[model samples]
Target: KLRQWLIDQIDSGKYPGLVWENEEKSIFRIPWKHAGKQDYNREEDAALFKAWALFKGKFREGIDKPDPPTWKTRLRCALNKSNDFEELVERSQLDISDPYKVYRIVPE
Candidate 1:
């Protein structure tokens, strides 16, 4: 029941914590704390605790074997909140000039 509740809570879209982007693809998002260490209130956060441990174990073992695992992953950087570009550029613009004076790092 705990596993079921956790899955439902994430997929249900009410809990702003976790998200199941594509269940068929086994793609989901776990809260930072949950994704890291499984520590929380046992009684007040029982469901989340169970969910964190359960999912964490599954994800760990799922990538344990085989030359390559089926699962793929990427991190959501909190810095993205400030990584916004407000300009629009066109190819037709011949006088290509550096608009922003701020130096930015090209991400690999």
Candidate 2:
């Protein structure tokens, strides 16, 4: 369901550089094939920030930028978290500043 929501959001044209190409189970790709360099950089920075915010507590390795983590790393972390709606809600309640709370994606 979250995958479909993500696909819908990508199709919404809000994240132009974040076009979903394909997925292999939990693995998906949003390559820099069509998007321009500038767009890719900006959207990547934007998306990375959200990924950091969402998975910071769960995944500690991506916190460093000296050697940046691959999108696959981030996606894996996201998948781990996405598997639990109760945890998402619990985290949301524990921290009002949680991205899940602001995005409110876990709730209907």
Candidate 3:
């Protein structure tokens, strides 16, 4: 659950924004930050959006599109896009059964 726990870090706003650290997890880096609400096209522009897309997508940027009940409720055709994201998919309960014309995510 280490992958998902990191997500909890942001949801709780423990460290909200672009953050990076060395393998030791001490040499941290924050690329940018601002205090505001979710902007339009946030799924395509916002840091959290981009992070979600990458974090949830798991490098399969096109393999997924999100449903309503957005949880954030702003952007469509977007959500989790990151490494180990498929695991989150299994956790998300998103039905990909015949979900259009591309890779179908099937978790193990």
TM-score of model number 2: 0.29
RMSD to the native, candidate 1? 16.5
Selected candidate, larger lDDT, 2 vs 3: 2
Candidate 1 per-residue C-alpha lDDT over 3-107 given as tens digits, one digit per residue, 9 for 90 to 100: 344446656665443554454623344433222133332222234443344554543435554211111121122212233311122311223232111111122
CA lDDT of each prediction against the hidden true structure = 0.33, 0.40, 0.33
Q: Residue 99 lDDT in model 1?
A: 15
Cα-based TM-score, every candidate: 0.27, 0.29, 0.21
Show where candidate 1 strays beyond 4 Å. Answer: 23-25, 34-108
Question: Once model 1 is optimally superposed onto the true structure by TM-score, how far is the C-alpha of residue 99 displaced, in angstroms?
Answer: 33
In terms of lDDT, the best-performing candidate is 2
Worst-scoring 10-residue span by lDDT in model 2: 95-104
Worst 10 residues of 3 by lDDT: 97-106
